[PDB]
C-alpha cells in the first residue's frame, strides 16, 4: 500500500496473508468463513507450496494473535491467463477452521444486484495489505489500509493501456500518490455500509503504483458470487 494508514487493532480482521516456504508474505487474501480464503489466481503461480496466516499486523514480532493454516484445496478459476489477467480470482479451503478473535474475522459476501446498485455506487471502498509502499521497495512489515474512491468505468478504460474487462473495476486516484501495490495482490477491497464491511473486490493489478493518470485494477467480486458459492461447496 502506497500512502494510506496503518491498520490499527481490529480494523482489518478479514485480511489474510499468503506465506511461502521461507515464511514470508507474497500476496494477500480475504477471510470469507472459518474454512475459506478469497485471493487472486495470479498469486497461485508464485510459491509452489504456501500457507495462510491470519490475525497478523506486524510480520516482525511474533505478537501472539497470529495463526497459520495449511491449504487443503486450491480452487483457481480456469479462465485466468497472464495474457489478459481476466478472471483473476481463486478460493482456498483450509485444512483447519480459522478461530475468530481480535483481528480475525470474515468479511461479508454481498448479493449481486444489491452490491452493484448499493455498494459499488458508493463513493469509496477500502483496500489493504502488506505490499510495497513504493513501486521500488520491499514488502511492508506493517499491515496498511487505504480508502480508494470508485472510478467511473469510462475514465477507467481510456486511462488504461490494457483492456479492462467486465470482471474488473477501477479504484484509486488520478494524481494523488496513494494506491495498492505489488504484494497487496489477492488482498481485500471492502465497501462499508452502515458499519458493516462487504468484500467487493480483489487486488488484481495496475500499471505501476500511484502513477499519475493511472488507477488500481481490482477483480469485480459481484461478477463471481455464484462461482464463489460453488467453490465454497467444494
Amino acid at each position: 500500500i502506497v500512502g494510506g494508514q496503518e491498520c490499527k487493532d481490529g480494523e482489518c480482521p478479514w485480511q489474510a496473508l499468503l506465506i511461502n516456504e521461507e515464511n514470508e508474505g507474497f500476496c494477500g487474501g480475504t477471510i470469507l468463513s472459518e474454512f475459506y480464503i478469497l485471493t487472486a489466481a495470479h498469486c497461485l503461480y508464485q510459491a509452489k507450496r504456501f500457507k495462510v496466516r491470519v490475525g497478523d499486523r506486524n510480520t516482525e514480532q511474533e505478537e501472539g494473535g497470529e495463526a497459520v493454516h495449511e491449504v487443503e484445496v486450491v480452487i483457481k478459476h480456469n479462465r485466468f491467463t497472464k495474457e489478459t489477467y481476466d478472471f483473476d480470482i481463486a478460493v482456498l479451503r483450509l485444512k483447519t477452521p480459522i478461530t475468530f478473535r481480535m483481528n480475525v474475522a470474515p468479511a461479508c459476501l454481498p448479493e449481486r444486484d444489491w452490491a452493484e446498485s448499493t455498494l459499488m455506487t458508493q463513493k469509496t471502498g477500502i483496500v489493504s495489505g502488506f505490499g510495497r509502499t513504493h513501486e521500488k521497495g520491499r514488502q511492508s512489515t506493517r499491515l496498511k489500509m487505504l480508502e480508494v474512491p470508485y472510478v467511473d468505468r469510462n475514465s477507467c478504460k481510456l486511462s488504461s493501456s490494457f483492456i479492462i474487462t467486465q470482471n474488473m473495476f477501477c479504484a484509486g486516484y488520478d494524481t494523488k500518490q496513494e494506491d495498492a501495490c505489488q504484494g497487496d495482490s489477492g488482498g481485500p477491497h471492502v465497501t462499508r455500509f452502515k458499519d458493516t464491511y462487504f468484500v467487493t473486490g480483489i487486488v488484481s493489478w495496475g500499471e505501476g503504483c500511484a502513477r499519475k493518470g493511472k488507477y488500481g485494477i481490482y477483480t469485480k467480486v459481484t461478477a463471481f458470487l455464484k462461482w464463489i458459492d460453488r467453490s465454497m461447496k467444494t
Binding site: A107, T118, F193
Partner: protein
C-alpha cells in the same frame, strides 16, 4: 423509491417484492422482528471490525 430510498431502511440486503420492500441479511445474521435490522448470531459476525 423503495430500495432506492435509503436502502428501504434495511441494515443490509434490500430487494422489492410485490412492489414492497423486503430486507434480508448475510449469513451469521438474523433478521430482526421489525424485518429491517440484522442481528448477529455469534461474537464474530462477518463484516464487523473487532473493537474489543
Amino acid at each position: 423509491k423503495l430500495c432506492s430510498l435509503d436502502n428501504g431502511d434495511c441494515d443490509q440486503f434490500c430487494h422489492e417484492e410485490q412492489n414492497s420492500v423486503v430486507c434480508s441479511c448475510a449469513r451469521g445474521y438474523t433478521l430482526a422482528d421489525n424485518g429491517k435490522a440484522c442481528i448477529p448470531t455469534g461474537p464474530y459476525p462477518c463484516g464487523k471490525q473487532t473493537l474489543e
